[PDB]
Ligand binder design. Structure first.
Ligand SMILES: NC(=O)CCn1cnc2ccccc21
Ligand SMILES: NC(=O)CCn1cnc2ccccc21
Lengths: 264, 265
């Protein structure tokens, strides 16, 4: 992969692997989400964040995901080459935004798009903080100055408020636990694992007859390595669903989300 | 990737990804196992397979793994390029063997090796069968004729008999269930998921202070999508060795047995 000519965005190509595909022989949404995070990590490395600055490190500050929104028009097939372009933008003191565009390498056609909201958090106390000028200035030289959005349309799905699913849930998958393969290099549960857990409570019939078109996921709290999760889903409708991930015992909310599925 | 000049083996390069590494910033054994299976699949495609012959498809026959043996000397770091060479060999009527060699692309040094035993099975009845001549002839033109082994040594670890772990287990991890990401394109649990399940019952202290050098895993029975698994481990041993058992949570039906050898960091 490489930064583009202006140095304000990053592109990378991926050949879809045999173990990365589902029953349709196309990439799963978890494979896509792993590639989005891989291209984000390579962008941070390419510009010297080897994604915290020296100022953030001295104050024990990290960027954490608050929201992830992905829209797929066509999933790449096993053996296909997909090209992903990524860039970041400041959202004032609220935090930052990372956007992505996915294209079929052979046709140049946009096959997907994603956006994510990141907030600054103290790694030890877990307390959220607003973005200061000293930090903003250090990142702004790596972002386009004019707005550049993967989801520019007015009243789009990436900025919609998500309600809390009320008991009883129509569907559920309980006792979900992370294994070592679900943890990142810092021993925290990978963000993509939560997408998988959300999808576990969708009935197999919907998965067999529909394709996932849109997923919006809010991250409220992290799941620890020794935590147990319950995945809850209710049909709200194309089929639309409301989702809730919560700790198995006390019922503490870890995530909330929505999915939209198209008939095959 | 590509077949080599003689067309009897296949090579491929991989750049290690950020989500593929563990706490030491190096590839996990599950990432290595996924790459071994990816290079095996690309080898089958490059020579016209999909990895059944037309004769096997007529009889509803498939190749299934009976044993997997992996030895890692050095795990590749995040951002490193690893080169993997793979080839197959017939083992008469018992089945076939797929071997692999892993190298650091920059130094050319062998950083790992693996071997696996495959048997022919009817897809529907799940009954094993010996390799017939008609089938053997169809894949022998894709294999080296002189023996070529990743583990040539006389008393190597890849051919050792594995005993059944006796209750009580020293360690255990109970209630393990596969999710959709653990299934392959045919909705069967991926072979690599069983390696992860075996490793789940190793204490975190061993993982934090040791590196996995060798893993030998026997595949006895398949875990269904709605099955629940119990992972059991007992220390058998500067090096720590363990005996492993995966069994169904209810009836205690054996799905896998294995051994691991770990060295101090
Ligand atoms: N959302 C993020 O990836 C936060 C870190 N970050 C903010 N602006 C950036 C520009 C380039 C690389 C990482 C950047
Ligand atoms: N061990 C296997 O991968 C079984 C299938 N198979 C047998 N001989 C082969 C030669 C090349 C590719 C796949 C082959």
């Amino acid at each position: 992969g490489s930064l583009t000519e202006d140095g304000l965005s990053y592109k990378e190509k991926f050949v879809v692997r045999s173990y990365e595909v589902g029953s349709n022989k196309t990439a799963t949404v978890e494979t896509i989400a792993n590639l989005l995070q891989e291209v984000g990590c390579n962008h941070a490395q390419s510009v010297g964040f080897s994604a915290t600055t020296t100022t953030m490190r001295k104050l024990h500050l990290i960027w954490v995901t608050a929201r992830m929104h992905i829209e797929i028009y066509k999933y790449p097939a096993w053996g296909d080459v997909v090209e992903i372009e990524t860039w970041c933008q400041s959202e004032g003191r609220i935090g930052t935004r990372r956007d992505w565009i996915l294209k079929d390498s052979v046709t140049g056609e946009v096959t997907g798009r994603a956006t994510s909201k990141w907030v600054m958090m103290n790694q030890d106390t877990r307390r959220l903080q607003k973005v200061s000028d000293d930090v903003r200035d250090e990142y702004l030289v790596f972002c386009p100055q004019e707005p550049r959005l993967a989801f520019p349309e007015e009243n789009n799905r990436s900025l919609k408020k998500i309600p809390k699913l009320e008991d009883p849930a129509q569907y559920s998958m309980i006792g979900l636990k992370p294994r070592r393969a679900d943890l990142d290099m810092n021993q925290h549960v990978n963000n993509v694992t939560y997408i998988g857990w959300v999808l576990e409570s969708i009935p197999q019939e919907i998965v067999d007859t529909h394709e996932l078109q849109v997923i919006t996921l809010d991250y409220r709290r992290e799941c620890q390595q020794d935590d147990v999760v319950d995945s809850l889903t209710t049909t709200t409708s194309d089929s639309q669903f409301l989702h809730l991930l919560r700790l198995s015992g006390d019922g503490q909310e870890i995530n909330r989300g929505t999915t939209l599925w198209r008939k095959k």
